[PDB]
Design a protein around this ligand. Structure first.
Ligand SMILES: C[C@H]1CNC(=O)c2cnn3ccc(nc23)N[C@H](C)c2cc(F)ccc2O1
Length: 297
C-alpha cells in the first residue's frame, strides 16, 4: 500500500552497451537511457542488474529502491529509478566516469604500473587539496546519512564512486560486491569488512553512527595511502587482534599530521569519546580550503 514512489523506467529506453563490473547481487553495465529527463534526450547511465529474482530478492529490491529514492544528496550517487517489467530486475544511476574511488586512488598512486589518463586530472599523485576534497566529500555524505539515523555497515573507498571534475559520491550502501580480502567469512552469507570495523562491532556486534565515524577514519587512511588495504601484511585474525587491543594504523607517508590527528580521533575505543561526523567534516572542509605544507623526511 503506502510508500515512496520510485520512478519506473521502460526497458525500451535502456540499451546496455557493455559490462562495467560484477557482484554477488548481480552485474553492473554501462547503458544509454532515452527521454530519462527532458534536459538530455539520450544519455549514459550505470545499471545494476539482479542475478536471482525470487520474491525474497524482489522484497529486498523494493526496500532498496524505496530507501535509495529517499536518500538524495550532493554526495550520494544519483538514483534515477528501477525497471521491474521483465527479469532481470534493474536499478539505474548516473554514470560516474572515474569508477569506484578505490581503483581511482590506486591509479594515481606511486606503485601504479601504468600512468592514468583523463582530461579532468593530472596523471600520478594527486594534490593534498585534492585528497582533502575527496575526504571532505565522503564525510559530507556521511553527515547526511547520520542526519537520517542511517547506518552504513561497509563504508570503504570501494563503495564510493568518482565522477568528472573529481566529484566523490557514496555509491553502494552494501545491503553486494562478491568477496575480496577486505571481508572475513564468519558464516554462510555473513561476511564482515572487519578491517573497517571498530571494537564495539567485533566485540558486542553493535553498529551506530559512531561506528561509521570509526570506519570513515579507515577511509581517510585508504585515501592517504592511494587505496592500500588496512593491515595488508596481517590476516583477518591478526587485524581483529589489532583493532581489539587498541593497535592503530601508522600515519601514511603522504598524510599531514593535522589529518592523522583527525584519523586518531575517529579511532577512540569509547564511541562517545569519538568526534562527531559533523566535526570531522568541518576540519576537512577547512583544511581543503587552505591545504597546509608537507614534505617527506
Ligand atoms: C561494478 C562497480 C563499478 N561501477 C561503475 O564503474 C560505475 C560507474 N558509475 N556508476 C554508478 C553506479 C554504480 N557503478 C557505477 N553502482 C555500483 C553498484 C557501484 C557502486 C560503488 F560504490 C562502487 C562500485 C560499483 O560498481
Amino acid at each position: 500500500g503506502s510508500g515512496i514512489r520510485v520512478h519506473h523506467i521502460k526497458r525500451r529506453d535502456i540499451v546496455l552497451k557493455w559490462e562495467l563490473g560484477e557482484g554477488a547481487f548481480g552485474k553492473v553495465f554501462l547503458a544509454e537511457c532515452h527521454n530519462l529527463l527532458p534536459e538530455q534526450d539520450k544519455m549514459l547511465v550505470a545499471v545494476k542488474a539482479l542475478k536471482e529474482a525470487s520474491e525474497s530478492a524482489r522484497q529486498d529490491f523494493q526496500r532498496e529502491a524505496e530507501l535509495l529514492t529517499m536518500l538524495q544528496h550532493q554526495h550520494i550517487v544519483r538514483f534515477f529509478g528501477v525497471c521491474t517489467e521483465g527479469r532481470p530486475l534493474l536499478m539505474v544511476f548516473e554514470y560516474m566516469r572515474h569508477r569506484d574511488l578505490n581503483r581511482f586512488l590506486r591509479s594515481h598512486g606511486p606503485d601504479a604500473k601504468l600512468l592514468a589518463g583523463g582530461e579532468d586530472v593530472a596523471p600520478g599523485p594527486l594534490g593534498l587539496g585534492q585528497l582533502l576534497a575527496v575526504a571532505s566529500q565522503v564525510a559530507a555524505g556521511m553527515v547526511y546519512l547520520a542526519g537520517l539515523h542511517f547506518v552504513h555497515r561497509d563504508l570503504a573507498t570501494r563503495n564510493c564512486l568518482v565522477g568528472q571534475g573529481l566529484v566523490v559520491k557514496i555509491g553502494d550502501f552494501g545491503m553486494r560486491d562478491i568477496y575480496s580480502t577486505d571481508y572475513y567469512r564468519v558464516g554462510g552469507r555473513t561476511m564482515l569488512p572487519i578491517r573497517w570495523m571498530p571494537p564495539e562491532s567485533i566485540l558486542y556486534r553493535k553498529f551506530t553512527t559512531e561506528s561509521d565515524v570509526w570506519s570513515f577514519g579507515v577511509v581517510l587512511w585508504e585515501i592517504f595511502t592511494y587505496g592500500k588495504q588496512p593491515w595488508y601484511q596481517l590476516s583477518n585474525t591478526e587485524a581483529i587482534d589489532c583493532i581489539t587491543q587498541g593497535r592503530e594504523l601508522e600515519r601514511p607517508r603522504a598524510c599531514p599530521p593535522e589529518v592523522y590527528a583527525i584519523m586518531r580521533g575517529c579511532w577512540q575505543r569509547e564511541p562517545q569519546q569519538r568526534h562527531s561526523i559533523k566535526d570531522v567534516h568541518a576540519r576537512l572542509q577547512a583544511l581543503a580550503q587552505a591545504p597546509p605544507v608537507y614534505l617527506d623526511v
